[PDB]
Structure formats: structure tokens, C-alpha cells
Amino acid sequence: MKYMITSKGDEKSDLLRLNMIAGFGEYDMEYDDVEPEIVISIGGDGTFLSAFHQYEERLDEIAFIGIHTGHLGFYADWRPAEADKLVKLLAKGEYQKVSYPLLKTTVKYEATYLALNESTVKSSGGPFVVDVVINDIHFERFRGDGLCMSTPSGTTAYNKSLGGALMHPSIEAMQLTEMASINNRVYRTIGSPLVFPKHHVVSLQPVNDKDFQISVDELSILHRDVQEIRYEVSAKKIHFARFRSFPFWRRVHDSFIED
Amino acid sequence: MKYMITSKGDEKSDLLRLNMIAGFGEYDMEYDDVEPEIVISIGGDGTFLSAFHQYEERLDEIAFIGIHTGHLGFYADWRPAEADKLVKLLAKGEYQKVSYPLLKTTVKYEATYLALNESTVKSSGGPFVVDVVINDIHFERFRGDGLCMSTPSGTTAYNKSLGGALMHPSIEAMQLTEMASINNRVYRTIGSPLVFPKHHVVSLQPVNDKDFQISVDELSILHRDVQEIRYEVSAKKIHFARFRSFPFWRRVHDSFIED
Amino acid sequence: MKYMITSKGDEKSDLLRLNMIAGFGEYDMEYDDVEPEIVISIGGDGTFLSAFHQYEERLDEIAFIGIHTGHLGFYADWRPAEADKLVKLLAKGEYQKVSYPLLKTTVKYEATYLALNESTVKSSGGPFVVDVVINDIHFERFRGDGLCMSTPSGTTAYNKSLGGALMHPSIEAMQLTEMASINNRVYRTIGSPLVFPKHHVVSLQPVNDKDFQISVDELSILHRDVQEIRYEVSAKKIHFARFRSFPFWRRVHDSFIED
């Protein structure tokens, strides 16, 4: 199979990558970073996120795998010590694929983005004020620091820090959380995180200022003269190559409770 | 069709019920509170919850409708002034059915319960301490006041007060929230609400004391010599009779933002 | 000096107590559990809390010291291994006293209680609903699970679990936190914890049911036919005997961040 390997670019990760490439040389495996079928990321979740965005135009043709040299690995299944076992298993085509939901962001002045973790919106530094419209229905006028829309796998990231729920990635949904909402006599938001199914469309519309800092995972990005920001669950999915059982809730336990 | 009407039992609700029965007398509609096909609740959500539990052995044969004389009505679609329009529409079979997910609780010493909103667990007054087991995997030792497991329609109730996410009821899931968790050097919980798909089983197991106060919606219930408490999304669903568009997110807006 | 020692009552604590008493026998130190000037607690914070309540009628005549055999010790300064150094330092009168604020609870049908950590109020099992009156001014109608009023040293306990602020115990104040407040169109609470100075009086008044479960630290206590529950910062203080520097914020760091 065609494969490539991205590295965090430190000594540890670069050497592990060189060793895996040497190991793949002993099988029918071609290194191709233009049209790979397998993308191996060696580093942290940041490296993994970069791999995803490198190859987001061929998501349906790629299965992703992560090796963690950190630190945490929510998108790592593998420790560096098991790199040889992985080469072997991967060479013999010994895996089933698992798909996770993604988030489509549309910015209208249209620019469209795909997020694996989340997309957030904040001011250019003045007040944030936006109207939140759900399936063409006006839901609330949000005043505060910003808003975050998360995929299920993203719920353990920024979402978690904002008080969001952790959602199993078999659920096809997206989750909206508030950053520092203003609530008083005058000014009212729901307060609570909101979980939306497939085919629901959440639209953010400016009230005064039309300049926003928009993030998509690790990318952040001042957008000027914005008319609308639209969120929905993508029709596209990320596919992981999976080689043993490592359930989501065990990954959550390992990352947050104890390992 | 066979129908019945439950009332909150105050003057307003009883008279509305008598008037609807008189109105149904002008159509091919038989009052039968043993085997109804339509159950009309007149009161608040408490009255509605009682109606549901009255008839939970024939959920697949019944479509529910709520008239609110309160106050709030998350399970009300109807104001008292529209009672005549409802009699008319209902008589002519002019409706599509909408189904919402339910929560199965199993208490092992087996007693099984069905919740429309939630089931909660707290101590008999001493410390609460339970082990939380997800699909046979030990996830955490919870120390605090209690735990709440919510259906999607229940997410606006007790769940919301505990910091839970609001979930659209088209999502087949259940949501676990903490009550006053202890977190320190020693003692660790996830903190965050957790959303589980269909077929996931969350099990609570005692550590010291085996006596718990368990609630299922409005029913609460000291259980003695408990071995296990098991939660999963039910295979059963509640069916509503629905006569116009009144989207979930608009109901949420109306109940929490402004009406 | 007159002293006594309370023990958690396990093997470890009882033996440490016997050894300290033997060590005190070599100085001018009289064991007197009726009118002690020093009260040594050996166990956890629960043991310490019991010691405090044992002797709350002679708080101005007593200095308290805690040895932790647990676990956590917010009211422990001492590990079991330093028990000999403590006997020595204490025998030679080698200490300055530090005072912490206390909370006065008055229950009117008057019963008055003193809390070192907190006093809480919940239902007898039905709805909790109370009117919150601050210095004779009606502030809110609280609907939810209950309320907690904390001393500064108590802010690390139940208060912390309810989202309360941690307050340095040099601040003469009390802090009110909510348990699962209901907030919607109809029903409104402040949401936020509230910190009150000395001489402010917070009064809770029943709306329907007049039966409440009231806790004062580890004591809990169904009160019937309640007219009022009144909170204010006590004029009385707890005195600790203190032998080296162990700042509050370092105790907090050690108990919650890492030790």
C-alpha cells in the first residue's frame, strides 16, 4: 500500500519515522506523500491534527494512525515501543476501519472548512455579540467572549474546558458551548451546552462588528466583513486504521482519570 | 378512537377535561382509561409524567398529548384556549406521530424501571461512593452527592440544573451528570457530563453502603441491599401525537429565553 | 498544661495517642478531657471536626492541633512521624495561636449551632423551595436541591464541590452556594456563589413545606415546623496552636494540586 509518515520534527519522532520507513521497506509498501492510503502521524495530537488537514481533500481514500511521543494521545493509539508491531500488522493488511464524525464550517462574506476537533468564533477584540439561529429559527443573542462548536472526538478538548459534555464518537452530532456569557436582567443566553444532530444547521450572525477571529482546530484566522458563520455535521468522515480494541471511554479514562 | 384524559385535579383542569369529553362525544370517540389509544394530559409536566407512568405497559399502543395549565410545558404542546381545535384535529385523525427515546434502569439485589426524564441515585444519608463501570470497563470511583442519568427530553430538567448539555431528542442517547463531586489529590472524577449511545451499558456498583435512594422521574424510592444499578437506552419509545410544527429548539427557547 | 487527645479509633491512631500521652508524662502536662487547654486530634478531618464539636462550649479556652493518619488533613498540620517533635514543642509552650472564623446557624420554630466547615439545608425529600432574605431584604426565591453556607476554612470542602470560591481564612466572611438551582422563564436564582461580611444576616424562609434536613458539619438533622433558618459570621473563633509556617495556600496546593 501507499503510505506516508509525518513527524513532530524532534529527534525522537524523526528517528522513529526513519525506522518505520526502513521496516516498511521489507514489505510491499510504497512511500507516497502525494496520494497515500495510510497516513501515520508521530508526535502529539497537534501533529495528528496537522496530518488530517494536510490530507483533507482525500479523507475517503485514507486511513489514519497515530503514534504518541508525548504526553497525551487521544488520536494516538500507539506508543513508540510498539512501532515494529504496527509496521508488521499494517503491512499484512490486518485491520478494520473506524469512522468518526466531522464538522463543516461555512463562512459567508463562501469559505468552507472541515474540523476534527472544533471551530470557535471570538471578536477582533471589541465586544462579541452574535445572533444564534437554529434551522432558520432565532434562538438567542449571545454576548460574551465567544462560542465553540465541537465534534464528538473534539468534546475532550476545548469543549471539555468550557463545561461541555463528552460524547461517544459513534454519535453523529456537534456540540455548542459558550465562553463567558453575560447573563443579567437585560441579556440572556441558554447557559447550557447544546447538542445538535445531523442535518441541523446553526448559523451565527453579526449584530454590530462584522470582524471575527475564527479557529478551525489549530488554524486561526481573522475574518473580515462576515455576513454569516454556518455549522453542520459534515457528510465526510475521518477513517482510522484500527488493530486492537481501545474503546473511547477507556481512552478518556486513561487521559483524565489515571494511566 | 379509544382515549382518556388525566387532570391535575384543580378547578381549571377538571373543567377543561369535562369540556373536551363533551366535545369528543360529538365524534366517534370512546372514553376508555383501561386500553386508550390516545392519552391526553391536562396540567403541568408533573401531570404528564404521571400519565406516562400510568400507561407504560402499553407505550407502543398509545400516542400522548399534553395541555399546559401552568407554568411550563415541555411535554405540553397546547394551551387551554386551543382545547376545541385539538378535539377537532384529534377526532379527524389529523396527526403524525413523533417518538422520543427512553431510559431503562435495572436495579439488582431485578427491578426494572422506565424513565421519560431521568433516574438519579443518592445515599441513604451517609457518604455516596459508587464505582462507575462502562461496558464492563471500570471508569471511575465517584464520591459526592449523587448521579443523574437523563434521556434527551429529560436534558432540560434535572440534568440542566446539574450542568448537563441539552440534547435534541432525535439523538438516541442518555446523559450522565454528577452532583457535587469530590475532587482532590486522592479522589478523582471526570467532572464532565457523559453522553452514551444506544447499546452502551453504564453500571453503578456500591463500595461500602449498599442502601440508595433511587428516583425514576417523580418516583423516589429507598432501595436496600443493592448489588448493581444498570442504565441503558431503552428499546421502547414514547409516541406523541403531533398536529403542527413546534420544534424542540423553539420549545427550549420559549421555556428558557423568552415567551 | 491541661490537654486531651481524641483518636479516630483504629490501631494506628490509638497507638500514636498512647505514645504521645507517655511522652507528655515526661513534662508538666496533665491529661484532662473535661477542661483541656490543648485538644489534639489524631485521624482525619472528620476526627478533627468531632473534636471541635466535643469542645465548642470552651472554644476561647482551647487551642486545637491535628495529626493526620489519612488521607487529607486541612485541619492536620502534622504527620504521625513528627508526633515526638510536637510533644516536645507543645510541652515547652513553643507556639503562636491562629484564629479562624466560624458560622452561626440559628433555627427558629431557637436552636443555635456553630459550624467549622458549613451548614446546609435540603428538603425532607419533596421539592426544596425557600425565600432568601439578606439583611431583611428579599433577594430571591430559591428552587433546587439545597443551599450551603460555608466558613472560609470550609470553602475547600462541600463549598468547593458546589463551585464555590476558595477564601483565605483571614477574611471574616461566609459563602452561600447553590445545589442544582432551577432556572427558566419562570424561576430565577443568582446562580453565583455569594460572599457575605461580618454582621450580614442571611435568612432562609419556607414557602410551602416547613420540614428540612439541616446539616452542621458532620451532624445532620431533620428539623420539623421550621419558621426560619438564620446565618451570620460568629463572634466566636477556633484557635489553632501553630508551631511552624504552613500557609493556607500551600495547604490548598498540597491537597488539590500535588504533594
Next chain:
Amino acid sequence: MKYMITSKGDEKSDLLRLNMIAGFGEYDMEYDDVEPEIVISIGGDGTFLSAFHQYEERLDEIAFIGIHTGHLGFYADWRPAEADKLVKLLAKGEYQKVSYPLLKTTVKYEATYLALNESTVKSSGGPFVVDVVINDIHFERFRGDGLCMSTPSGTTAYNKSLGGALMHPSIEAMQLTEMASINNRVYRTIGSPLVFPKHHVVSLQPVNDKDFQISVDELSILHRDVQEIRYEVSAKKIHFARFRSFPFWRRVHDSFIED
């Protein structure tokens, strides 16, 4: 007395100001915006905050008064309709002064600032990571969006939105709240807001990046090559001219519960 009046600068506020000046012309009152003894603000809390910062070098020589043409007025005592009664009462020297605590911010590369509401720190857009040092004791490594340090009167503002406690302004203290803290296996913060007495010093120190966006009330301000950010309760206080009883907790009730 020497006085001046700042206006929000809309039609309503400018005309009210012109009318008050005309009314003051009938008493022994000199308009002096260089060395006033009374500073009247007409607008919102934003206008009030600007007045405070206009005159922060002569805080001990000035008593402040606010008229609200909004909206909310936490620093307003007065509605526009009572402007005449105020001119009269103020002319006759008919008032007692009330003082509120302030927050000193020191930024070391020293620049010092005084806040009436709060000072916050966030990244220049990369990760925020800072070491939190309390009275020279290392307390935590904070990873997240930022931190907020609030005065007692500021606790109803940004602080409240971040989950902070509301504190009565007779308490001489400052309150530190987190913005979106990261908490996992690796990375740990206290979570809870922290309340510090007078004479406690909280210091923030950079870990990697040394560029921060620092706010002081409405002023925000990229600081480059930062070595330290230091917070303590100021020795300086803001004085209000006060003409009738309008207790803090009633102001809170009116702004957040109902008016």
C-alpha cells in the same frame, strides 16, 4: 464645590448634563474638569469606568456619582428623572461617602495600573501558559485561555461570567478566576475561584511566550517582553457620594433577578 460631568455623548446624556450644569449655576458650584471634588458620570458603567480612569491620580480628593441612561448601572445610583433632586442634594453637601477597594496591577519588563472592575491576562494568540505564584510560593502552572483578577465591585462583571463569587464591597479582597483551564492526567489547575485578602501578592510568570494581552477594565493592551504580572489589593480606594440607602445586595437583585 468644584465639579465636572462626563457624558456618554448621545442626545439624552448631553442634554441631561447641560440641564444639571444650568441647575448647578443656581448654587455655589464651580465647573472644573481639571481639579473637581465631585465627578458625575451620565451614561452606563462604561462611561463611569472612563470617568474613574480620567481622574485616577486624584482619587482621594474626588467623590464619584453615576446617573444611568442605560441599561444597567452598578455604578449608577440615579435615574435621569431624579437629576434635579441630585443637583439639590449635592449642592447642599447632603451626603456621606462610601469607599470601595481597588486592584493594583504591576507589569514588569514597571508599569502600574489601577482597576475598578478587573485586570485580565490572555496570550497574543498562541497557547497561554503561566506560573501562578502566591506570596512567593509556587501554586500552579495554568494552561488555558487566560486569568481574571477582580475587585469586589468587579465581581458582578467579567468575574461573574467566569463562575466567580459575588463579594460584598466592604470586604478588602481580590478574586482570581480561570478562563477555560486545561485539566487532565498531565495538566492540573485548582479549578475554583480564589479570594485573596489585603497584602497577599499573586504573581503571574511566563513559561514560554512572554507576550500577553493585558486588560485593565476597558483598556486592553498587548504587552511585550513581560517578566512578571503582579496583583494585590490597592492601598487606594474609590469614594462614592451617597445620598440614600441602596445596598449592594439590592443592586445585585435589581440587576440580575428582577427590577
